[model samples]
Target: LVPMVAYDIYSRLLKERIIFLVGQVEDYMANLVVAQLLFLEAENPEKDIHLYINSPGGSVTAGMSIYDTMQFIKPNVSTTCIGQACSMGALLLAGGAAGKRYCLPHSRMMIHQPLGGFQGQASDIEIHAKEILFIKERLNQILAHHTGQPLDVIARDTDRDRFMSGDEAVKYGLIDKVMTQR
Candidate 1:
């Protein structure tokens, strides 16, 4: 009963075509994000959906789930960076529809190679390492595709934690514009 009331608040916002993705991106959060996106798209195919994100980024696979659904849906997904978008979070921010990505003036964005920690036999460790490399390449490709930068440039910059302010993010192609007023 109590939970239902709280969820009603979220449902009300959904009716307004707004979705918040705050905190680390993980399975539960990703599931909620994708489900909300699908629900909103099915509710009204023409209206745009606003996704406000402020995440430090978590699982790559989880983030991919949200990213894939955003592309799969018919409605335009406008992503707004509220605080900081790092790693997979940054990727999702960049994945917003072209000319639809927005960032708050003080928000930060970051991109980097996928991090991994293997705890297994030697051969298993090798396999995990290979998979992480594959994920890294795939993420870099997506970043390059969205940012309109060459693969090499994306690859080089993401070698470490590459941070950008809102204006810098616009210049770097991660954001379309910085929000100044309502």
Candidate 2:
């Protein structure tokens, strides 16, 4: 049988060592809090950091910042998609340590191209559109290399919302395992 720990906001904060990243992935404020928490209880050999992600995705730049930080940090970040992992969320999970990515059995994972529009000057709009294209290609390359799928496949798959079940994700090389609760 599982044991329940003493729980309360304060008590739980002191007792737990998890970085629960929920909701839309946004600015450094949230990401900064996550950063502080990672180092709050720094220890030897670097303890495994469980990053629980459930987001519909937000800023690609913000998500990239978090992803890069996770990679730069000492611990092996094990990302688990307990709920929807769409767009940037999917990329973040894909950025987890190779073979350490996971998803709940019933969770849905999605990947798609970056999107944005500028309503300023015509030239400015064109520039922003080009920037989005670059970001999309860059994301596609990263996903392709990480998932072991061809770059073309990544580009094509990301052109539209590509949803995958936990099992299908495993085959697609997005996640290493589908959780079977202990």
Candidate 3:
């Protein structure tokens, strides 16, 4: 029989209230991040939570769940885009706590309309496509509300694959600040 071993759980102290999100935003990642937020909030309801993101984006629903939890939590959630916050990742970055959002000097951001699918029966596919449109509009509204931009502006900007650098993102109201403190 092989021996079982486990690493020390308290190897590192929780000195900073930080959560690092890398790679795809799948259901498991979303659940883990939300639980982390809940744990931090339970310990310090009034503290600020720092989220460092570096992803190429993934499931929209998963990202939405994290976005919703960021708003639903008691503590303030601040997001810093360290690399690329594209698609759903961009939405998560935009959904950060108002002006508490930031991006590194060379980080990138992207936003675009929700992709549609035409699989299965025609009726079912049509319904799914319409739902995609609705989701796109709702995401636009969320981005607008968070970035202080108009609905029409967000709609126009998000109609295509819109990419921007950290400074350009600030100019487009996607992020509040550009930091180089990596």
Candidate 4:
């Protein structure tokens, strides 16, 4: 019988860990395209896929897909805020598993009410209203999932451009801990 062999099976395959950046709204679609492609690696089965994030957030529907995809991963996924995790970025970071995420002391995470660009009749406003509620629900769903807190608190605190530092994020259960450069 042959002994269990250990070789660099991934010498020809892609690397296991990848970090992505979303600087533009279009980057969301691009990130999804790549994430789905690399989901086949499955190399680091036990470790959380780490991400260093810095974005002001993006389009409504696009942000949802990215946030949802981050949650779709079964492995422990963690995120770090390099500069800003505002708007949709905050939502995605909140969905990551507990005790596995971190952010540098200088990083920031912010949340705020949804914005609608439409200005029209009452019927049109109603449509925008529904869309706003839908996004709020989605945001709360992810935040609650990570923090294990009710939606009401998250909603209240983040209802209007609520911003937090790495320390504050740990206190609010958004991230597992803070990181130091020492």
Clash numbers, per candidate: 0, 0, 0, 0
Compute the lDDT of residue 9 as modeled in candidate 3.
28
Candidate 2, 5-105: lDDT as tens digits: 55655335433455666788789545763565457436432666667778888898888888777777777777889888998888888888889999998
What is the lDDT for 120 in model 3? 89
TM of each candidate vs. truth: 0.94, 0.87, 0.90, 0.78
lDDT of each: 0.92, 0.80, 0.86, 0.70
lDDT of 4 by residue, 1-182 (tens): 42332534332222445455456445646466347424732665555676667778776567666656666666666677778888777776776666867778888888787776678899998998898888788777778778777888878877788989998888888888888883
Q: Give the TM-score of candidate 3.
A: 0.90
From the highest lDDT down, the ranking of the candidates is 1, 3, 2, 4
- For candidate 3, the 10 contiguous residues with the lowest summed lDDT are 5-14
How far in Å is the alpha carbon of 106 misplaced in model 3?
Answer: 0.7
Better lDDT candidate (2, 4): 2
CA RMSD (A), model 2 = 3.8
Candidate 4 error regions (>4 Å): 1-16, 27-37, 40-47
After superposing candidate 1 on the true structure, give the runs of residues whose Cα lies further than 4 Å from its correct spot: 1-8
**C-alpha lDDT (0 to 100) for residue 137 of candidate 2:** 83
- Tens digits of per-residue lDDT for model 3, 1-182: 43333523221223367887889989998888888888889989999998888988999889988998999989999999998999889989988887899998889899888875677898898898889888988989998888888999999988899999988889887899999865
RMSD of each: 2.1, 3.8, 3.8, 7.3
